Design a protein around this ligand. Sequence first.
Ligand SMILES: CN(C)C(=O)c1ccc(F)cc1Br
Ligand SMILES: [Zn+2]
Length: 139
Amino acid sequence: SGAIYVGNYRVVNRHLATHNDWANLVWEDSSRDLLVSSTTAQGCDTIARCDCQTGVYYCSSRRKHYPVSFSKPSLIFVEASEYYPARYQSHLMLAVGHSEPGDCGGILRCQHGVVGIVSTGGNGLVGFADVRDLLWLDE
Ligand SMILES: CN(C)C(=O)c1ccc(F)cc1Br
Ligand SMILES: [Zn+2]
């Protein structure tokens, strides 16, 4: 699990979104595994605005941050899961690293701030849902 909190926005894996998230829906994209909901408290996180392909992500199944190289956000075929059928996930970034289902919502960070959140894994790869394109998260 895990979320990004920026201004009055909460960014979560669409597949981990609660009833409060859906009751306070701002925007959801099933093909990206993202849902944003509205919050009352002000969030302290900064979204990266950049095209970094290096950063650090939190891996809850190792209680460890790992530095990774990651591919630019693209449309990648992702196999069926405990939460989805096999489909093209959009705006997805892969790196070589450890990811289990419960690692979803781990944050990937570069020097500019938050890049995205763990969304996919398996076969020694970790997939991160990019958020850097969502400029509206910052006003
Ligand atoms: C077989 N497979 C794809 C996994 O166990 C997996 C790994 C990480 C993740 F975030 C989601 C899943 Br589903
Ligand atoms: Zn960056």
